[PDB]
Design an enzyme around this catalytic site. Structure first.
Site, PDB file in Angstrom:
ATOM      1  N   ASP A  82       0.819  -1.213   0.000  1.00 17.34           N
ATOM      2  CA  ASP A  82       0.000   0.000   0.000  1.00 17.34           C
ATOM      3  C   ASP A  82       0.855   1.266   0.000  1.00 17.34           C
ATOM      4  O   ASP A  82       1.951   1.308   0.570  1.00 17.34           O
ATOM      5  CB  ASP A  82      -0.938   0.049   1.206  1.00 17.34           C
ATOM      6  CG  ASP A  82      -1.804  -1.192   1.353  1.00 17.34           C
ATOM      7  OD1 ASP A  82      -1.505  -2.242   0.742  1.00 17.34           O
ATOM      8  OD2 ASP A  82      -2.857  -1.087   2.042  1.00 17.34           O
ATOM      9  N   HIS A 106      -1.150   4.709  -0.428  1.00 17.25           N
ATOM     10  CA  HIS A 106      -2.164   5.581   0.163  1.00 17.25           C
ATOM     11  C   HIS A 106      -1.745   7.045   0.135  1.00 17.25           C
ATOM     12  O   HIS A 106      -1.747   7.732   1.152  1.00 17.25           O
ATOM     13  CB  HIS A 106      -2.500   5.153   1.587  1.00 17.25           C
ATOM     14  CG  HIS A 106      -3.364   3.932   1.662  1.00 17.25           C
ATOM     15  ND1 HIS A 106      -4.596   3.857   1.049  1.00 17.25           N
ATOM     16  CD2 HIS A 106      -3.189   2.753   2.302  1.00 17.25           C
ATOM     17  CE1 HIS A 106      -5.142   2.679   1.298  1.00 17.25           C
ATOM     18  NE2 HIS A 106      -4.309   1.991   2.059  1.00 17.25           N
ATOM     19  N   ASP A 156      -4.159  -0.030  -3.530  1.00 22.33           N
ATOM     20  CA  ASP A 156      -4.272   0.984  -2.481  1.00 22.33           C
ATOM     21  C   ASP A 156      -3.271   2.119  -2.668  1.00 22.33           C
ATOM     22  O   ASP A 156      -2.405   2.373  -1.816  1.00 22.33           O
ATOM     23  CB  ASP A 156      -4.143   0.313  -1.114  1.00 22.33           C
ATOM     24  CG  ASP A 156      -5.464  -0.249  -0.613  1.00 22.33           C
ATOM     25  OD1 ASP A 156      -5.597  -0.469   0.622  1.00 22.33           O
ATOM     26  OD2 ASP A 156      -6.393  -0.361  -1.438  1.00 22.33           O
ATOM     27  N   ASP A 205      -6.376   7.593  -1.284  1.00 20.33           N
ATOM     28  CA  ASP A 205      -7.019   7.730   0.023  1.00 20.33           C
ATOM     29  C   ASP A 205      -5.985   7.845   1.137  1.00 20.33           C
ATOM     30  O   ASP A 205      -4.827   7.443   0.966  1.00 20.33           O
ATOM     31  CB  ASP A 205      -7.986   6.572   0.313  1.00 20.33           C
ATOM     32  CG  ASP A 205      -9.228   6.599  -0.566  1.00 20.33           C
ATOM     33  OD1 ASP A 205      -9.870   5.536  -0.738  1.00 20.33           O
ATOM     34  OD2 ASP A 205      -9.564   7.677  -1.093  1.00 20.33           O
ATOM     35  N   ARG A 206      -6.409   8.422   2.272  1.00 21.03           N
ATOM     36  CA  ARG A 206      -5.659   8.570   3.521  1.00 21.03           C
ATOM     37  C   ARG A 206      -4.492   9.552   3.478  1.00 21.03           C
ATOM     38  O   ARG A 206      -4.407  10.429   4.341  1.00 21.03           O
ATOM     39  CB  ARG A 206      -5.163   7.219   4.032  1.00 21.03           C
ATOM     40  CG  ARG A 206      -6.191   6.121   3.961  1.00 21.03           C
ATOM     41  CD  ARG A 206      -6.935   6.043   5.291  1.00 21.03           C
ATOM     42  NE  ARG A 206      -7.639   4.774   5.423  1.00 21.03           N
ATOM     43  CZ  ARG A 206      -7.282   3.814   6.268  1.00 21.03           C
ATOM     44  NH1 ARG A 206      -6.256   4.008   7.091  1.00 21.03           N
ATOM     45  NH2 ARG A 206      -7.954   2.669   6.297  1.00 21.03           N
ATOM     46  N   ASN A 247      -8.625  -2.374  -2.803  1.00 18.86           N
ATOM     47  CA  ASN A 247     -10.019  -2.086  -2.487  1.00 18.86           C
ATOM     48  C   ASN A 247     -10.308  -0.593  -2.431  1.00 18.86           C
ATOM     49  O   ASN A 247     -11.486  -0.209  -2.461  1.00 18.86           O
ATOM     50  CB  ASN A 247     -10.475  -2.727  -1.160  1.00 18.86           C
ATOM     51  CG  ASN A 247      -9.605  -2.373   0.040  1.00 18.86           C
ATOM     52  OD1 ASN A 247      -8.363  -2.346  -0.003  1.00 18.86           O
ATOM     53  ND2 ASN A 247     -10.282  -2.056   1.136  1.00 18.86           N
ATOM     54  N   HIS A 248      -9.273   0.254  -2.355  1.00 13.10           N
ATOM     55  CA  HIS A 248      -9.458   1.698  -2.419  1.00 13.10           C
ATOM     56  C   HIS A 248      -9.498   2.206  -3.847  1.00 13.10           C
ATOM     57  O   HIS A 248      -9.787   3.385  -4.055  1.00 13.10           O
ATOM     58  CB  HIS A 248      -8.359   2.429  -1.637  1.00 13.10           C
ATOM     59  CG  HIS A 248      -8.555   2.372  -0.155  1.00 13.10           C
ATOM     60  ND1 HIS A 248      -8.982   3.452   0.585  1.00 13.10           N
ATOM     61  CD2 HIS A 248      -8.450   1.337   0.714  1.00 13.10           C
ATOM     62  CE1 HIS A 248      -9.101   3.093   1.851  1.00 13.10           C
ATOM     63  NE2 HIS A 248      -8.779   1.816   1.957  1.00 13.10           N
ATOM     64  N   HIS A 250      -4.160  -7.942  -3.909  1.00 12.01           N
ATOM     65  CA  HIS A 250      -4.173  -6.958  -2.830  1.00 12.01           C
ATOM     66  C   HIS A 250      -4.552  -7.600  -1.501  1.00 12.01           C
ATOM     67  O   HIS A 250      -3.802  -7.497  -0.517  1.00 12.01           O
ATOM     68  CB  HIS A 250      -5.120  -5.803  -3.136  1.00 12.01           C
ATOM     69  CG  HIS A 250      -5.135  -4.765  -2.050  1.00 12.01           C
ATOM     70  ND1 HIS A 250      -4.052  -3.959  -1.779  1.00 12.01           N
ATOM     71  CD2 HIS A 250      -6.086  -4.428  -1.145  1.00 12.01           C
ATOM     72  CE1 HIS A 250      -4.335  -3.158  -0.765  1.00 12.01           C
ATOM     73  NE2 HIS A 250      -5.569  -3.419  -0.367  1.00 12.01           N
ATOM     74  N   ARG A 299     -13.734  -6.352   9.051  1.00 14.95           N
ATOM     75  CA  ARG A 299     -13.942  -5.192   8.197  1.00 14.95           C
ATOM     76  C   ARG A 299     -15.396  -5.040   7.777  1.00 14.95           C
ATOM     77  O   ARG A 299     -15.757  -3.997   7.221  1.00 14.95           O
ATOM     78  CB  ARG A 299     -13.062  -5.277   6.950  1.00 14.95           C
ATOM     79  CG  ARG A 299     -11.560  -5.250   7.194  1.00 14.95           C
ATOM     80  CD  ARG A 299     -10.864  -5.374   5.850  1.00 14.95           C
ATOM     81  NE  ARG A 299      -9.442  -5.646   5.966  1.00 14.95           N
ATOM     82  CZ  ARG A 299      -8.489  -4.731   5.855  1.00 14.95           C
ATOM     83  NH1 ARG A 299      -8.807  -3.463   5.619  1.00 14.95           N
ATOM     84  NH2 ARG A 299      -7.221  -5.090   5.974  1.00 14.95           N
TER      85      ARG A 299
HETATM   86 MN   LIG Z   1      -4.591  -0.118   2.520  1.00  9.26          MN
HETATM   87 MN   LIG Z   2      -6.650  -2.441   1.254  1.00  8.85          MN
END
Ligand SMILES: [Mn+2]
Ligand SMILES: [Mn+2]
Length: 298
Positions: A63, A65, A91, A94-95, A123-124, A172, A220
């Site tokens: 990841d 991000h 990923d 995001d973040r 998944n992002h 992922h 999750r």
């Molecule tokens: Mn992640």
């Molecule tokens: Mn993820």
């Protein structure tokens, strides 16, 4: 004369120009440059198979991000393309707060070196998730909502898994109870959003769990956890040596599971400013032996 064809080599230069700078410094890409990135890479993603067949040697990252200067840091340790081949595991956005630079450099490299640079869906890389975890805000603030939708149409065409020299299976998230055969991955139809159930969802969302046998529910709220037995059986059934996944923060940047049959890679150091983790990048050589370059948090 006023209009020009978009130059990928030129965009890579402006993206790498901030290498000698402080984290936060943005990169002014023009809105038609980004649509070129999305549309040209989208076309490459669609031509190439949804289950990639890759060859070692290759560097592999987890990841990112939106930690754009950590992406640059990874290339400084690994070698900027085309010095090393790359597989990223999802990923990208995001973040963090420079998802735009992060995904743009990856798309550029996908376009420039399409046989040597590969990125998987995480998944992002879905419009639904990234409208809650930051990438939507970032595109709206720096551009406009219509550009953000250009990204998600491209995200919907991303490949979802990879096999390195028939022996290392990469995705992922993890395994799926519905993964009847590799052909089932090849038949996943693009573009698609990530569903809430099924094979594609689990590949991008599931997690291993040392303290479980078989499949159990995932905290999750989506997909499942799987135990060491599940990894063992899958590698026997498929005649492979390693699963390489990401999706979870791990303190040392990498972390094996089920007697080194599975490895979790995470490539964003000091994730979110909270976790005190290293990032790791996994190097696979022609003998399919794995070594790790460690990026400790600044
Ligand atoms: Mn992640
Ligand atoms: Mn993820």
């Amino acid at each position: 004369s006023d209009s020009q064809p978009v130059d990928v080599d030129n965009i890579i230069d402006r993206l790498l120009e901030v290498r000698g700078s402080k984290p936060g410094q943005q990169v002014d890409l023009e809105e038609n440059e980004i649509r070129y990135l999305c549309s040209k890479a989208r076309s490459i993603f669609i031509k190439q198979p949804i289950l990639l067949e890759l060859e070692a040697p290759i560097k592999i990252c987890g990841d990112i991000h939106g930690q754009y200067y950590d992406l640059l840091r990874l290339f400084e340790y690994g070698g900027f393309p085309p010095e090393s081949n790359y597989l990223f595991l999802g990923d990208y956005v995001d973040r963090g707060k420079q998802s735009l630079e992060t995904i743009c450099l990856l798309l550029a490299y996908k376009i420039k070196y399409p046989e040597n640079f590969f990125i998987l869906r995480g998944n992002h890389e879905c419009a639904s998730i990234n409208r809650i975890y930051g990438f939507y805000d970032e595109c709206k603030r720096r551009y406009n909502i219509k550009l953000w939708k250009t990204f998600t149409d491209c995200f919907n065409c991303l490949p979802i898994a990879a096999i390195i020299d028939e022996k290392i299976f990469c995705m992922h998230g993890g395994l799926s109870p519905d993964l009847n055969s590799m052909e089932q991955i090849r038949r996943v139809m693009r573009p698609t959003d990530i569903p809430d159930v099924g094979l594609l969802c689990d590949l991008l969302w599931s997690d291993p769990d040392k303290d479980i046998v078989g499949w159990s529910e995932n905290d999750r709220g989506v997909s499942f956890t799987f135990g060491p037995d599940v990894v063992n059986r899958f590698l026997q059934k498929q005649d492979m040596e390693l699963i390489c996944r990401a999706h979870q923060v791990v303190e040392d940047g990498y972390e094996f599971f089920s007697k080194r049959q599975l490895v979790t890679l995470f490539s964003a150091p000091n994730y979110c400013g909270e976790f005190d983790n290293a990032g790791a990048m996994m190097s696979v050589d022609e003998s399919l032996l794995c070594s790790f370059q460690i990026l400790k948090p600044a």
